[PDB]
Design a protein around this ligand. Structure first.
Ligand SMILES: CCCCCCCCCCCCCCCCCC(=O)OC[C@H](COP(=O)([O-])OCC[N+](C)(C)C)OC(=O)CCCCCCCCCCCCCCCCC
Ligand SMILES: CCCCCCCCCCCCCCCCCC(=O)OC[C@H](COP(=O)([O-])OCC[N+](C)(C)C)OC(=O)CCCCCCCCCCCCCCCCC
Ligand SMILES: CCCCCCCCCCCCCCCCCC(=O)OC[C@H](COP(=O)(O)OCCN)OC(=O)CCCCCCCCCCCCCCCCC
Ligand code: SF4
Lengths: 155, 284, 96, 59, 97, 83, 175, 98, 70, 115, 99, 318
């Protein structure tokens, strides 16, 4: 029936969305160079199918990597809106997650989620490279359990 | 109607050129994600550049007034986040100086070993990341495989990958796991080849030189007066190095050849760094 | 090596051209018969259709001289089909 | 470069004020004199060799 | 001759992975066709391997089970599926299972 | 002499490119004058019969032109196949 | 259709000319002209001018008009003055689409159009000439005569072009 | 005369009119200049190819390489105008007056 | 190792294979086994128009020789 | 016949390619999404200013050289002439005039364009 | 020319191309070589105004060879009458018209 | 059956283009001790499909200050030229046997710069505008050496007919006669094709993405497809030009074996270079071409115009 044909169509879209999401690392602090270590041939997320792409209009998922300050806050938000749909943000590190070490200071926003709708929370200070790689695996697993076409069919 | 000017040089109008204030960064890849560089341009020619810093400003010193000395130690690990152990070296040396307490000689030798290992950590990204922005991308992964190896060494001793929290006032927190000196020795033997790998890749390449040679040159006096330090002075021929002039810890009981350049441009510092890589390997 | 090869091609070209030279007599004679025959077919059609024109004597020599002129292609294929016209005007021209 | 820490101890068990000499701070200060008479595609080059990490220059 | 041995080793991979079915299974489930000695098995179906010939890292590895705590995991893969007592050995924190 | 050799070597020290191009341009402009094959080049170029050599009316007393395209009379290019 | 294919090609040529002649935005004016530049070569190609047709593509389509885009990129009038921005350019465009549509209708009925010159509305194919060109492309042989008989022309053309780079620097030097 | 020939002739005339009927952008005026010769180049090829004037085939290029040289002057004069005045406007190109 | 790249370019060999094989075989198939007789000059074109007219089936590629003349 | 058909078929295949690359992925839009991107900050208002002379200068020099190379395409056919001596003298004359314009251009600052 | 320097020193600069009946590459003709040769030799050593009227037959024939105005006017009337005749259906084109 | 042949040429070219990104990613990756895509399908065979249809399903945002119509015609022009680049290629028997194919091929390649100019203008951003102007001045500067090299190289061929190149190279590769021009040609194509070190047009590190700074999803694919399509055809053009191969009339298959193998190998060198050399700078880019490339090309053209007369080895025009 239509339910079966819509189940395979979104799966076909589901395949690419979980295998071709080009990430962006908003290089902020030691979390960023930690991401850069997963870029080493040790892990090479490119083998999963994701490549570091600049020009936020081209990317699908953007990773906050480091501590967020009020100065950095308006720019990080506005670049998030111009990021095309679907757009997912991954909080890497305690500072990005909830401020971490800089959670009480006068010039850090407590948690990056106060600015953007965080999809995946990656703990760590810094999160080890494969631990952040694990978060990317979760994001594809979360992407797998989406019902965009199913919802529209029942909409 | 007015009579024409006598010299026929009709008077020039208002300025019809602009300096095009450009908002470089932070999303721009070359801006380390966190830079607000703004500068003025007459065409490609640049007039002035304002490096608007602050996009990563944190309390740091503000909270140190409220954290104890032990609690304040991890702050330095996150200060110069590429040189993990070297910052704690500064803090531990300072704090133990006030306490008039000197660490045991075994602790001193551990600090210098990881300090120069940290010197390998920092210098690798310093050149490779510059190689990323300059173009050719391969040197990054080319050597970041090695960066994982002493990162694995960091984990074996302290227990964490980056922020070791190892160098504490009074020495080091823990002792090395048995055999750790052996594995780092294996890395040390093979690492000099990897340095040769880079020099083969970049040193004689025309494209790298022409994008680097005779670029950003400074005189010795301005470099010193500008408060510069380390390679920024040694690249300009300034004869100075803290480990040699004021040997802290056990740096006096070891010899190393400070790589003093004689041009001061971008190229001299690059050769100064790669030799510092080899001279770091001497310390290991 | 390229010097010797190019000289050989020039000998090959003149050999190819010489075959064309021998082929000119038959080709010229065949085209000579064809073009004037097809012109006569045009004139024969002219004197079945211009018989009713108040003043149209068939075969007016538009040029004043009695010297032969190569038929302009308009009066040659003008009364033929669309396929004949297209294949003749730009037939060589198209030929991708 | 020269990473120095200047702290004042009040005699208690906690630091009273700690100022850190960031090598990038002086270097980034001199970035203006660096860029004089150079290409825009060279400002990235001089920035690279200045060994600036903003966690250090921004304190 | 050397290329002949390498081709022979390539065919031995298919024989080692239970013929054609297992070779296609692991390739489309783990992107790995390298076979090592069996080293252990938890009470979950998580086949564990080990091959000292490989360099540090890939020298010991895993293919996860198909059924985990009443959950389908044939296609999807997770790193936390590893039980704790075996997580110690897998990450080379201890070279004895 | 001494200046010329020094200048050429000194120029070939900083720039190898333009001295090479000047050598090539200076060379290629010379050999065609002294080349012994240019006369051959025009001869074979003239030998190519693009158009048909229309026959001439035989009124007698021109033995040079042959009466048949096999007779020894007329232009011959036995050099061509050997060249 | 293939009866009057060159009728079409020349027709787009006229409307392409009306485009930039209607004084639109310079970038769009370039678009209208290059469209006319592209369609014009097809007219030449239909007549056997393969080399001449390809030239305007190489030195004029992808040549002259490319550096024109720089001056348009240099001028950058403070608002785009494109077709919708002004109303007289629309009137220029609408007008420029009128007479050639009017006269082609005038032409196609009685073929007796006498605007300035006596013009026939007959099919494009007629004026062609019948006869083989053998193995030598008539266009190529004529162009290759530059270095055979066009000796005087090519010296003057070369000298003037040499003066061309002399003047360009001198005027652009700005003392 | 063949309908094709009149199309280029009227193409020139409207192109020449666009060159003469100014507006506010001598950019657009210049665009009418090479287009005006483009019709000349196109038309010249038409007769020359049609009539088998073999040596005349040189002339379309000769017209081309020289009308192109005028662009070198015309655009270079433009930036000179867009330097002392900044823009490519024409109504402000009246400093001479008296 | 490096041979895992080979399947990536092995497919490429197939992709670039198709245009070459097709235009070769379509030319062969359409033109009765022989390749497309090209006419870079007007001479070769009017050669075909003789062939097309002389074939009696209005196709140049149909070749008919000594079996016709008497 | 086949030529503009090849242009036609390629043009269509491109147009359907962009057509379903627009309507099919049409989901939702916002002003911020359509806002210009300038390194992640606010655009102050630009792309409406002239760029000195150097880009223009190299543009004009290219055209002048491009027009000179336009004069020397027929050389492969020119080599098939009967009087080669007239050809090689004139063809060389074009070539060193290319050099002369470049040589003049070089010494008078020229290709070391403005800054 | 205003100063016929070409005639004085006898070096040919432009007149090799000025007419189509002169020497041509590979000895191939123009469209109207026969007519232009006739008109040219009619109007040599005569005078511009004298040859304007005396060599009138040659000029118009050569012009008609080049433009081909009246000849295709003949064809246009032929076609116009044909379409005004076969549409009403009095005469049918023979097979050789349609092949 | 001409239409089917047209499809039989264009989809396989596009199919090869998609797999380039895979081999681009993988050959690059292995060249730097990495692995490249190997999870999405066997050895990443399905990665281009995953990449392609994701960008197809990604919403194509148009900038607020866009000319929409110009924002669309430019990618159309870019890809349409890229496919039409292949119609005169001498692939055993060339599809469109244009006697002036080389002139045709140059004209379309030069016309490709209109995509760059309109891309920056329609985007209407300072970064896009300068990136486009920087891009176009790079390529238009490199046209002159592109045309001169062909004029010199083809001078020993006989004409501009691309099919005739096979006859000239029947015995030895054309590179042996003009190896100085072969590297002269190869670098200029690299600058034309906009690959590292000539990536200032894109400037992944310092110019964001150049003309593709805003182009996303749908209209980005055309530029990305047009870019990579030109890579093959330029390498294919170099393959036929200098690295010629024998062609048996009774077996055109063998020539296809050689041509495909050569052109894929030449493309391999393209990203091989991209993985070895740092990015150029404009002044170096402008200076290198007009100070060390033009004079050398001019002299070499002078060498090759006189050489056939020097050795009486002029080639037949037929
Ligand atoms: C100055 C260098 C260029 C001119 C001199 C060298 C070339 C001479 C030449 O081609 O002469 C052609 C002709 C003489 O012809 P020619 O006898 O050399 O060659 C005839 C070739 N056919 C038969 C095919 C026509 O002379 C000129 O064009 C002189 C032009 C003026 C030269 C001086 C200008 C100052
Ligand atoms: C009788 C004999 C007649 C002929 C003899 C000819 C002379 C002898 C041969 C000379 C060498 C060949 C001609 C010159 C070639 C170099 C031109 C040049 O400008 O060089 C210096 C140039 C410029 O060097 P530069 O900029 O350092 O110095 C130039 C000189 N100054 C400083 C004064 C300006 O070199 C380059 O441009 C470097 C390469 C740039 C491109 C980057 C990618 C390179 C990839 C290389 C590997 C792949 C090669 C593929 C080859 C083709 C395969 C099919
Ligand atoms: C065979 C016998 C002859 C062999 C060669 C002998 C002459 C050698 C001449 C060497 C070059 C001229 C002298 C020299 O060294 O000039 C260097 C200089 C470099 O200029 P630049 O790179 O800008 O650096 C300085 C400013 N910063 O140069 C310049 O500033 C001027 C550069 C001018 C470039 C002109 C190139 C023209 C095209 C190539 C030559 C073609 C053939 C010309 C005819 C040659 C006839 C001999
Ligand atoms: S979470 Fe930890 S590692 Fe990450 S930026 Fe904050 S302090 Fe640094």
């Amino acid at each position: 029936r239509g339910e079966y044909v819509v189940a395979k169509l979104d799966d076909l879209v589901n395949w690419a969305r979980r295998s071709s999401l080009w990430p962006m690392t908003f290089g902020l602090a030691c979390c960023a160079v930690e991401m850069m270590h997963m870029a080493a041939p040790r892990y090479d997320m490119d083998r999963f199918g994701v490549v570091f792409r600049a020009s936020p209009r081209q990317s699908d998922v953007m990773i906050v990597a480091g501590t967020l300050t009020n100065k950095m806050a308006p720019a990080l938000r506005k670049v998030y809106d111009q990021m095309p749909e679907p757009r997912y943000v991954v909080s890497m590190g305690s500072c990005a997650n909830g401020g971490g070490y800089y959670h009480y200071s006068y010039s850090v926003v407590r948690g990056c989620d106060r600015i953007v709708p965080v999809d995946i929370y990656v703990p760590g200070c810094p999160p080890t490279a494969e631990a952040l790689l694990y978060g990317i695996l979760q994001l594809q697993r979360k992407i797998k359990r989406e019902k965009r076409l199913r919802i529209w069919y029942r909409r | 109607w007015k009579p024409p000017p006598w010299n026929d040089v009709d008077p020039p109008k208002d300025t019809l050129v602009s300096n095009l204030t450009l908002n470089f960064g932070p999303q721009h890849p070359a801006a380390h994600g966190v830079l607000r560089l703004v500068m003025e341009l007459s065409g490609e020619m640049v007039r002035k550049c304002d490096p608007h810093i602050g996009l990563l400003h944190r309390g740091t010193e503000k909270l140190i007034e409220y954290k104890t000395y032990l609690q304040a130690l991890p702050y330095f690990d996150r200060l110069d986040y590429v040189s993990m152990m070297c910052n704690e070296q500064a803090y531990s040396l300072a704090v133990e100086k006030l306490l008039n307490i000197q660490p045991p000689p075994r602790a001193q030798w551990i600090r210098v070993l990881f300090g120069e290992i940290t010197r390998l950590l920092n210098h690798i990204m310093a050149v490779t990341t510059h190689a990323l922005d300059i173009g050719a991308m391969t040197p990054f992964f080319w050597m970041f495989e090695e960066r994982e190896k002493m990162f694995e060494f960091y984990e074996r001793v302290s227990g964490a990958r980056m922020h070791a929290a190892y160098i504490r006032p009074g020495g080091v927190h823990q002792d090395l796991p048995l055999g750790l000196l052996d594995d780092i020795y294996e890395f040390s033997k093979n690492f000099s080849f990897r340095i040769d790998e880079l020099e083969e890749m970049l040193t004689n390449n025309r494209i790298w030189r022409n994008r680097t040679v005779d670029i950003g040159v400074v005189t010795a006096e301005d470099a010193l007066n500008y408060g510069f330090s380390g390679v920024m002075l040694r690249g300009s021929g300034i004869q100075w190095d803290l480990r040699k002039t004021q040997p802290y810890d056990v740096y006096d009981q070891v010899e190393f050849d400070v790589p003093i350049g004689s041009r001061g441009d971008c190229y001299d510092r690059y050769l100064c760094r790669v030799e510092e890589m080899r001279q770091s390997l001497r310390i290991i | 090596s390229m010097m010797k090869w190019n000289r050989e091609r020039r000998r090959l070209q003149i050999e190819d051209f010489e075959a064309r030279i021998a082929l000119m007599p038959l080709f010229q004679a065949e085209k000579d018969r064809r073009v004037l025959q097809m012109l006569r077919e045009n004139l024969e059609e002219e004197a079945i259709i211009m018989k009713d024109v108040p003043d149209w004597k068939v075969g007016e020599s538009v040029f004043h001289t009695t010297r032969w002129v190569t038929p302009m292609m308009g009066e040659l294929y003008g009364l033929r089909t669309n396929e004949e016209i297209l294949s003749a005007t730009y037939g060589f021209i198209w030929y991708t | 470069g020269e990473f120095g820490v200047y702290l004042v101890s009040d005699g208690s068990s906690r630091p009273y004020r700690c100022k850190i000499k960031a090598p990038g701070f002086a270097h980034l200060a001199g970035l203006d004199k660096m860029s004089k008479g150079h290409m825009l595609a060279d400002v990235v080059a001089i920035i690279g060799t200045q060994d600036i990490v903003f966690g250090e220059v921004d304190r | 001759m050397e290329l002949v041995q390498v081709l022979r080793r390539g065919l031995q991979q298919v024989s080692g992975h239970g013929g054609l079915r297992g070779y296609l299974r692991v390739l489309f489930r783990a992107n790995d066709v390298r076979v090592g000695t069996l080293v252990g098995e938890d009470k979950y179906g998580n086949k564990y391997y080990e091959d000292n010939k490989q360099f540090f890292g890939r020298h010991r590895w895993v293919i996860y089970t198909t059924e985990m705590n009443g959950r389908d995991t044939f296609w999807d893969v997770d790193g936390s599926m590893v039980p704790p007592e075996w997580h110690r050995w897998l990450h080379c924190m201890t070279d004895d299972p | 002499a001494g200046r010329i050799a020094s200048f050429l070597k000194n120029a070939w020290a900083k720039e190898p490119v333009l001295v090479a191009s000047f050598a090539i341009g200076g060379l290629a402009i010379i050999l065609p004058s002294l080349s012994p094959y240019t006369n051959y080049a025009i001869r074979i170029n003239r030998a190519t019969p693009y158009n048909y050599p229309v026959p001439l009316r035989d009124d007698g007393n021109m033995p040079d032109v042959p009466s048949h395209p096999q007779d020894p009379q007329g232009p011959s290019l036995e050099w061509l196949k050997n060249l | 259709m293939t009866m009057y294919i060159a009728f079409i090609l020349s027709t787009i040529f006229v409307i392409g000319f009306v485009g930039f002649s209607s004084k639109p935005s310079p970038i769009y004016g370039g678009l209208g002209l290059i469209v006319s530049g592209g369609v014009g070569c097809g007219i030449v190609l239909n007549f056997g001018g393969s080399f001449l047709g390809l030239m305007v593509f190489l030195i004029y389509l992808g040549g002259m008009l490319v550096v024109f885009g720089y001056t348009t990129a240099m001028a950058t009038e403070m608002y785009p003055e494109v077709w919708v921005s002004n109303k007289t350019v629309f009137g220029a465009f609408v007008s420029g689409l009128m007479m050639e549509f009017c006269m082609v209708y005038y032409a196609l009925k009685e073929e007796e159009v006498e605007i300035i010159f006596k013009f026939n509305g007959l099919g494009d194919w007629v004026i062609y000439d019948t006869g083989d060109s053998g193995f030598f492309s008539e266009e190529a042989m004529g162009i290759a005569a530059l270095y055979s008989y066009g000796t005087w022309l090519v010296i003057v053309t070369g000298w003037s072009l040499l003066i061309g780079v002399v003047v360009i620097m001198e005027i652009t030097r700005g003392n | 005369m063949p309908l094709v020939y009149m199309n280029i002739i009227m193409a020139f005339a409207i192109a020449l009119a666009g060159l003469l009927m100014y507006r506010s952008h001598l950019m657009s005026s210049l665009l009418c200049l090479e287009g005006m010769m483009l019709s000349l180049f196109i038309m010249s090829t038409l007769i020359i190819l049609n009539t088998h004037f073999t040596l005349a085939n040189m002339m379309p290029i000769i017209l081309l390489v020289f009308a192109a040289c005028e662009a070198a002057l015309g655009l270079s004069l433009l930036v000179m105008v867009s330097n002392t005045y900044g823009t490519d406007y024409v109504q402000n190109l009246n400093l001479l007056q008296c | 190792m490096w041979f895992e790249i080979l399947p990536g370019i092995a497919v490429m060999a197939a992709c670039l294979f198709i245009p070459g094989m097709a235009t070769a075989h379509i030319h062969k198939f359409t033109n009765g086994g022989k390749e497309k007789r090209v006419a870079h000059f007007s001479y070769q074109w009017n050669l075909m128009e003789r062939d097309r007219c002389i074939s009696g089936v209005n196709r140049y590629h149909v070749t008919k020789g000594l079996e016709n003349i008497d | 016949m086949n030529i503009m058909l090849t242009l036609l078929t390629n043009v269509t295949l491109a147009s359907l390619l962009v057509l379903i690359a627009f309507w099919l992925p049409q989901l939702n839009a916002y002003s911020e999404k359509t806002s210009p991107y300038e390194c992640g900050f606010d655009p102050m208002g630009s792309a409406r200013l002239p760029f000195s002379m150097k880009f223009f200068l190299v543009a004009i020099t290219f055209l002048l050289f491009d027009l000179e190379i336009a004069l020397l395409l027929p050389l492969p056919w020119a080599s098939q002439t009967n009087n080669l001596k007239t050809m090689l003298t004139m063809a060389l004359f074009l070539l060193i005039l290319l050099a002369a314009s470049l040589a003049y251009e070089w010494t008078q600052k020229g290709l070391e364009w403005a800054e | 020319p205003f100063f016929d320097v070409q005639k004085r020193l006898g070096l040919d600069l432009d007149r090799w191309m000025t007419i189509q009946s002169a020497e041509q590459p590979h000895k191939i003709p123009g469209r109207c070589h026969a007519f232009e040769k006739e008109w040219i030799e009619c109007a040599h050593g005569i005078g511009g105004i004298r040859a304007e009227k005396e060599c009138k037959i040659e000029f118009d024939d050569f012009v008609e060879c080049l433009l081909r105005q009246k000849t295709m006017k003949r064809l246009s009337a032929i076609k116009r009458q044909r379409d005004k005749l076969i549409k009403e259906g009095k005469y049918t084109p023979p097979p050789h018209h349609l092949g | 059956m001409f239409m089917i042949n047209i499809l039989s040429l264009i989809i396989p070219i596009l199919l090869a283009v998609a797999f380039l990104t895979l081999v681009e990613r993988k050959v690059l990756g292995y060249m730097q001790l990495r692995k490249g895509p190997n999870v999405v399908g066997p050895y990443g065979l399905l990665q281009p499909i995953a990449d392609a249809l994701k960008l197809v399903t990604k919403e194509p945002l148009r900038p607020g200050t866009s000319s929409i119509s110009m924002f669309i015609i430019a990618p159309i022009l870019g890809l349409s030229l890229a496919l039409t680049m292949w119609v005169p290629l001498p692939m055993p028997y060339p599809l469109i046997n244009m006697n002036l194919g080389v002139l045709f091929m140059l004209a379309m390649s030069s016309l490709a710069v209109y995509s760059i100019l309109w891309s920056g203008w329609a985007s209407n951003s300072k970064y896009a505008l300068i990136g486009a102007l920087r891009a176009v001045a790079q390529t238009i500067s490199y046209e002159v050496t592109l045309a001169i090299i062909l004029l010199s190289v083809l001078l020993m061929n006989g004409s501009y007919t691309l099919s005739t190149l096979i006859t000239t190279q029947e015995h030895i590769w054309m590179i042996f006669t003009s190896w100085p021009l072969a590297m002269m040609w190869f670098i200029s194509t690299l600058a034309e094709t906009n690959r590292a070190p000539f990536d200032l047009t894109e400037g992944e590190s310092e110019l964001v993405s150049g003309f593709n700074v805003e182009y996303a999803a749908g209209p980005f694919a055309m530029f990305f497809m047009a870019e990579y399509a030109n890579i093959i055809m330029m390498n294919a053009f170099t393959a036929i030009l200098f690295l010629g191969a024998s062609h048996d009339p009774h077996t055109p298959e063998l020539y296809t074996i050689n041509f495909v193998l050569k052109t894929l190998a030449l493309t391999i060198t393209f990203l091989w270079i991209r993985a070895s050399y740092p990015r150029f700078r404009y002044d170096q880019l402008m200076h290198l071409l007009w100070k060390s490339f033009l004079p050398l090309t001019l002299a070499l053209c002078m060498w090759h115009i006189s050489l056939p007369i020097m050795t009486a080895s002029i080639p037949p025009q037929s």
